């Protein structure tokens, strides 16, 4: 027995690994975060802390009640998850009436959860409800060229989605919903963390500007494509645009037909374009 | 006997794979290879094969792929995932002996199965069978960055591509002197798209798909995905010098044409024409 | 006692200058880093040091830093080989008692030796130590490939360079609000050079050196690697920004005022008119 | 004795090529690496080469190459293959007495051949023997990416681009004070570039193939690849500084020559006229 | 990448890590080395040492050659393999002519491969040949009541094999092949490594006298649940020869229709007995 | 819907295994359980079913529990691996309509297929349903040390072993007033063995198998599993006992009569008598 | 910095005392461990210690242990809780400069105090230093359940009890050649006591304490655990071997000699005689 074996800590530790080596998070950038059940960490109770802290939540988040989630830490490095799992990943259950949670295992040296927590757990919070229980991860990331994207193309969620559905055949069908765009926030605050839940409604990717992205998923690796694919879309169309813009491009009807062939319904307000 | 996962085409499918996730051409569940295979070379593990292998109805009679055995990439699969989890993301099938079918006789694991772009795959291999009178053995598609750039800004035209990636690099015109076909975007996994492209493998080794990939035949593993590599690294050089206003000079037509000559090798008029 | 390769700052050393590489800001022998010690630290390893310690003389005195131990990497060294051998591109040294220079006590085999920077290093990791009390304990020097473009196409001004940098990336402000200090071109390696820089380190713990690279400062390996490769990756992002046309839209001046704000930290002023 | 594998240069040539690749700049097979060695070297596996050693009519004889041993890269290798199976992508071959052949002592196997190019590396070593009293003992080919665009954008002039490289990077200067070489596009493989390339290896360390790629002398594997590195790192700076609409500043006709003023060596002169 | 949750690395954890709680290996008591292929160990080409250390083998394995495996290192105890595996554990890979091995990963700090290596590597060559390749593991612990049986009973195969068949209708058809039995031997010595691989050749299953035993399986847990199962048939004969004695027990005629029932061929010796 | 790996049976099964296998009653793949489940606890779970389960062919008709679904042990499973891999070590099996066979609905994935010891199982939960009128639903196999042990030392008798294991701890009469039944030694994992383990679990809820292990009946996963722990608990101290040469006192008939009225439960008399 | 918990120290202390209770080998508060460290393993602590340490005198002067810091385990403390409090049962104390006493730098909380029996341990680690030259750093107790048991048993007698644990596993000669000294039963916590073992310490590094435990010296915490594993272990095959009628053959005089030899280990002369 060593939970950092376990499904989940080698999930997470693999996950923002990859995300080092994509180079979407240098320094403490981007976080992550997924729902766990108890029969995931029950095999190891006697692995967690026996004096568990105790901190209380930014507000009341019943439905996330006695809900064990596995996260990074605050001010951690991706790129040293894979390393110390232990001092940089914590498992935390939030307690009996959504107030706060208990520090379970990891986030060792007083460390604590990631800043962007409200916004994660109230983005959880959304998906559950939308996905019926489905999606279980949350990720945060400073993908590089959706972020460039952000300073070139008018922060429209219908227009971006647009032209993240024609930089890659591929986009379409994998977020069908399209993704939604909020106006510049202060990060870390609760007030961003709303606005993120609120879209985290109507869509699976969310979109920062001159920050990152956000994303949901059932698995680990489901989120983590989710986002390489709209990244990928995005350093296709940086190319394209640096070399001119798009001479031709996926028209509507081929959109709609795409859309078609893949029992996926496509946001409306995109398809409109 | 040798457990299967350590034979020479699992690994080599285990290594191009994630060759290509590296060079970053296979993001999500994008791109799919398929290696056709003897039956000397599955026969000795006959051992590892399911004992109720499924069976799978064919887009279409492929009689010319009768009775042959194919190790393929997994649909829904993640490139990134196949090192770690061969037999979940790759399998070995057999087609049938009337080219109706195919059995999964080894791995797809977890009731997985072959690759959605399967249709266009099987028929360019025929077409690659009896254009090389079967020398190749190999159908490659992935999401190389900057070839999918290209079809955004290049007039989406075989000759006109083919000269630019010729341009592109003075190895290409001797590594695919047939130049690469392009097509109109299709909605893709379809028959639609399969037969469209198998009948440009008829033509050229290498396909494009505007606004979504390449696609690639070849004899071996390596070659094939080196034949793909080269078109993507020309692609990378003209992506950097059209984002630096274009060509000030290139490689010249004469010059083209004395490369040609000097490899002994015959390239496309068409593209040579420009 | 567990060897001192093993030592947490040993394969930090390794850690850093091989991300270093990795991410392309180390070709050849460009940059270098150096990392202050207490004596609790190599203390353990007695062992492993020299039985007769090669003793260098400081060019000029460094008293403030008498008796202090620091692990560096090696002049001549390629980053991309300190993991190939530790000893030998990396080595402990430790001024004497009256800074008048010091013993390599572990390391920097077959006559190599330290950074020939350790000069400009030492010059900095002092006027480092008086502005944070102590705190700073890391000068690292590298070629960030995005930093040293941008400084071809941006006024090399402290404060407009600041303020693209914040506006690059909404963490920017909050991980170098006193921004970043810009110098003339310099010729490398003189006591002008490490003046300068010196100079500038009293107000920002991250400097830039026109058509060359970045200086950064920290308190450890991954705060002093991470905060470079912040200000990098805003500059990376900023590259592909200027080469699709400039900003449409960005980070309000207001804005950064209330990302100050709320993370309770004080903007370099004058990046914040202009 | 040791297997050779685990010798110094085999692991150098292991590592040599495949940083190559993974820095995207042998695709296929693309790019090849000889290094001259000592009978020192491989006096300690002499039983490790093959008991009736291959022996191959070298072109033309090269009389100041008798007897010298060189580990290189064969023909139609993946540099990406090195790193499985050296013996079957490097063979260390040894000239005769009169410099009229030589003799495939270790590896390749499965009767692989040297590039076939040793003629063109052979022939510039010549010069680079001589224009360094024996010193230089690399030349390496590689499709340096953005090397290669330059040269669709800039003027194929060894001065202008040598200038150009030098403003990209400050120790460029000091690295190849000699500046680059520039020929004009050439039918690869012919013994006209085998030969012009050589001229100018007399001038120059580093010579660029329009549309094709780089050719490098240097002392040892690591000069000779930090030498192109630097060069290439020089040129990635460049891409993006001209895909931002190129330079508002650089480092000035005065600095460079106090740059190699204060490093003790000489610029090319033509190349700070224009 | 980070070989140490490759499959094998955490396979050897969770071996020794489960012997250690069978309470089977006390200090440094205990060694157990897998072979492994060079696909298993591609992947991490670069998690290596980039200086592989070089040790003389004892004699000429040639039928090892090229060949990789994992071991556990010498004075190491099995109780901290778990902890830190690169310390505990060391991958070598023997030379093209059976005479030694490259330490390619792990064994840190000058540390070297168990003392019975020896006996390892000859009774692997021995198992190969017998199983045609399918054995790969070799392991070797101190099984308590193994260990007290070789005071009590006769050390010899047939009646020591006749007497673990009795212990658990399970072992005739774990180990019909049965256990062979050396006369105490000086350890780690290559006179004992061979007399090991010379009844590896008839028997999966070997016990040292006053030592412990030795084992061989295709893969970790079954060579796990070998020992395991000759060890649960000890304990249990243990405390039955404690009580007395057996009254009553398996016949020989049962055990006979046994092993038909499992397409299994008893040791002979053992089932004239 | 929450993956049936998170449903209360499955746990239910993971937690009775792993306590099994830590207690030292379950070597190698010595032991087997099965739990006889309502239609209504699967019915939830449908999504997560095989989508071709595996049928298989029953050892006997068995209408008695058609239509039944039971969550399963693995032929060839160790206990020990449960918790790790559920899915590959657990099944749920479904008999169909006339008790002639079951489809593998989920689980036992890898062509694994329900313990060796099924026919036994099914055929003590039809006597044990019987008996219980529906309220027993586990059976339980495992190798529990002591009890084992004892087999070779008592005399293999019902009411003798029974009348020592109520000596051996004061609530075995109360827990299992049915005493224990044993059979003779009886090759395993036939049907020979099913039979008469199914004719004693008409009588008593715990059967013996000498030098093998025991059989458990009850209600519940806990039930059961205290059902055993309490047998062994008692064979555990005997063997103590035993091993100190024998009871100097115990419980004595009157005594044990005592116990039976005050929990109003009835002894079995034979064992009683004694 | 690391908080002091995270230390390898305070780690190796929550490790031994935990293993020690799974082991069974200490029931209520007992058992005791202390280690020997140097400055420079808690001088990295600093901030993590008490600001104004409490100190007490030691009842005799230990000079010899002047300056020297230990971490310990506390009076009355449950080894089964160090890891649930590591401050609250363990403290890191610091002997004075002429060791009049010691300060409680860290741990021991809510007014707990070192074992009763620094003193004893003290005591011993001034012989054990002596007799190791300063390699020695452990001191422990534990009541090892078969070596206890086994006193009751066995002759007390050094030498014969010493021949019986080599007998009862191979390994033991090695690990402790030197024997095992055996002390008649004594009240504990006596300065007698202290003083008898301290006189067995100088001569043995594993002592026995009739019908009470063992103790034992390593250098480190691992190779004095592993002391009394090894010496525990032994005594449980031994039990096992007794309580079946004694030995029928064993490890003979002559092979125990032979095994001495082949680890050139010294075996105690007396237990070879007899
Ligand atoms: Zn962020
Ligand atoms: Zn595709
Ligand atoms: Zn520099
Ligand atoms: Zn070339
Ligand atoms: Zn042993
Ligand atoms: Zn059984
Ligand atoms: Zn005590």
Same mark, same amino acid.
């Given at each position: 027995?060593?939970?950092? !074996?376990?499904?989940?800590?080698?999930?997470?530790?693999?996950?923002?690994?990859?995300?080092?080596?994509?180079?979407?998070?240098?320094?403490?950038?981007?976080?992550?975060?997924?729902?766990?059940?108890? +029969?995931?960490?029950?095999? !190891?109770?006697?692995?967690?802390?026996?004096?568990?802290? !105790?901190?209380?939540?930014?507000?009341?988040? *019943?439905?996330?009640?006695?809900? *064990?989630?596995?996260?990074?830490?605050?001010?951690?490095?991706?790129?040293?998850?894979?390393?110390?799992?232990?001092?940089?990943?914590?498992?935390?259950?939030?307690?009996?009436?959504?107030?706060?949670?208990?520090?379970?295992?990891?986030?060792?040296? =007083?460390? @604590? *959860?990631?800043?962007?927590?409200?916004?994660?757990?109230?983005?959880?919070? =959304?998906?559950?409800?939308?996905?019926?229980?489905?999606?279980?991860?949350?990720?945060?990331?400073?993908?590089?060229?959706?972020?460039?994207?952000?300073?070139?193309? /008018?922060?429209?969620?219908?227009?971006?989605?647009?032209?993240?559905?024609?930089?890659?055949? =591929?986009?379409?069908?994998?977020? *069908?919903?399209?993704?939604?765009?909020?106006?510049?926030? @202060?990060?870390?605050?609760?007030?961003?963390?709303? +606005?993120?839940?609120?879209?985290?409604?109507?869509?699976?990717?969310?979109?920062?500007?001159?920050?990152?992205?956000?994303?949901?998923?059932?698995?680990?690796? =489901?989120?983590?494509?989710?986002?390489?694919?709209?990244?990928?879309?995005?350093?296709?169309?940086?190319?394209? !645009?640096?070399?001119?813009?798009?001479?031709?491009?996926?028209?509507?009807? /081929?959109?709609?037909?795409?859309?078609?062939?893949?029992?996926?319904?496509?946001?409306?307000?995109?398809?409109?374009?």
């Amino acid at each position: 027995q060593n939970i950092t !074996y376990s499904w989940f800590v080698q999930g997470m530790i693999k996950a923002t690994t990859d995300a080092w080596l994509k180079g979407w998070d240098e320094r403490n950038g981007g976080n992550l975060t997924l729902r766990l059940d108890d +029969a995931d960490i029950a095999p !190891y109770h006697d692995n967690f802390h026996q004096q568990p802290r !105790y901190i209380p939540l930014s507000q009341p988040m *019943p439905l996330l009640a006695n809900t *064990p989630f596995i996260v990074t830490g605050s001010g951690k490095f991706f790129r040293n998850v894979q390393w110390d799992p232990a001092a940089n990943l914590g498992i935390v259950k939030v307690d009996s009436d959504g107030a706060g949670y208990h520090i379970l295992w990891g986030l060792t040296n =007083e460390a @604590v *959860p990631t800043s962007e927590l409200p916004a994660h757990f109230l983005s959880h919070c =959304e998906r559950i409800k939308a996905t019926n229980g489905k999606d279980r991860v949350i990720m945060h990331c400073h993908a590089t060229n959706l972020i460039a994207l952000t300073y070139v193309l /008018e922060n429209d969620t219908a227009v971006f989605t647009r032209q993240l559905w024609e930089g890659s055949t =591929e986009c379409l069908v994998v977020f *069908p919903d399209g993704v939604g765009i909020l106006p510049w926030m @202060v990060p870390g605050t609760d007030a961003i963390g709303q +606005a993120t839940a609120q879209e985290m409604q109507k869509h699976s990717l969310v979109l920062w500007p001159f920050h990152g992205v956000f994303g949901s998923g059932p698995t680990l690796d =489901e989120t983590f494509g989710l986002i390489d694919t709209a990244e990928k879309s995005a350093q296709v169309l940086v190319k394209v !645009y640096s070399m001119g813009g798009m001479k031709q491009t996926i028209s509507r009807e /081929e959109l709609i037909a795409l859309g078609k062939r893949f029992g996926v319904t496509p946001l409306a307000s995109a398809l409109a374009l």
